[PDB]
Write a protein that binds this ligand. Sequence first.
Ligand SMILES: O=c1cc(-c2ccc(O)cc2)oc2cc(O)cc(O)c12
Length: 326
Amino acid sequence: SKARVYADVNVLRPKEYWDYEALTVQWGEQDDYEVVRKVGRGKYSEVFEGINVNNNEKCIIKILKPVKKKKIKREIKILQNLMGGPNIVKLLDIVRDQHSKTPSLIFEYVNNTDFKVLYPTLTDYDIRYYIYELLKALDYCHSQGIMHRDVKPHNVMIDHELRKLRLIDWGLAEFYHPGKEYNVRVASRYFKGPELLVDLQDYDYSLDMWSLGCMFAGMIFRKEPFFYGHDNHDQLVKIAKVLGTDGLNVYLNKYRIELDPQLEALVGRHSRKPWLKFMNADNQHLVSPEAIDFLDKLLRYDHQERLTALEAMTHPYFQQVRAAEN
Ligand SMILES: O=c1cc(-c2ccc(O)cc2)oc2cc(O)cc(O)c12
């Protein structure tokens, strides 16, 4: 399998662009940036609101947990390559503690509201707006040869006052090369595409569009997370119970993949559940025919069948957002 768009990006570009292991980091001054308060954390980092003591402007200090050289260089290289692209978080500096060599990444500050409290307040129009802004970031990173591989609401910072969105945490992101087999242990469980769950390793940018579809379904149906599996096997079961197993079998046959007998037994056989079955009184004002058409075009087993980010942005679902911008 191969990406249907942007497959040649890293091929045309000089090796320096994608050869992240050859990067040599130029370290800033640790002292320039002071921690004000903790804002977040995950398996690989802790995140603090900070102050640049020179200009007294706010920043984000991302303190990395013990990480291998290769992986830190990958995140840094991707951030540098993408710096300045639409709605991509801006990496401003890279610093380290002299004693322990603990690295911190320094970013622009976004006055975020956590999705668990933000998303339930969003109007129909705001959902269309913010999904469009997120699509700008994804089309940009894909156009630059990069898959994010961890799209989820936790990685989308929104200053709802300034209507500003940034796609953050490029720590799982990778360069796309035609024919390459990737680790499937990427993306957060609830946002893992079928490709990850059935061990299809030669995946591409389309993985992010599945994750976006999950995020989107969660928003319009007010069911967060939308596919709620307890482990990676259960995650495929949850998907199969929505999309149906008939669709799953054609997919598996196309890419000549056989499931583990344990997984096959858990998946069983399931009818397709139409999208309107998720509609209720609470989500009613969000679940229009255009929303459904758009969602249906993202949540496809076959990664080659999903809308590209560029296509998604042209969907009639976003026509009002485009018109406002034009
Ligand atoms: O402005 C923010 C930026 C970041 C951030 C987190 C990881 C990155 O690679 C880059 C930026 O995380 C946050 C996490 C929060 O809970 C709140 C934030 O405002 C931010």
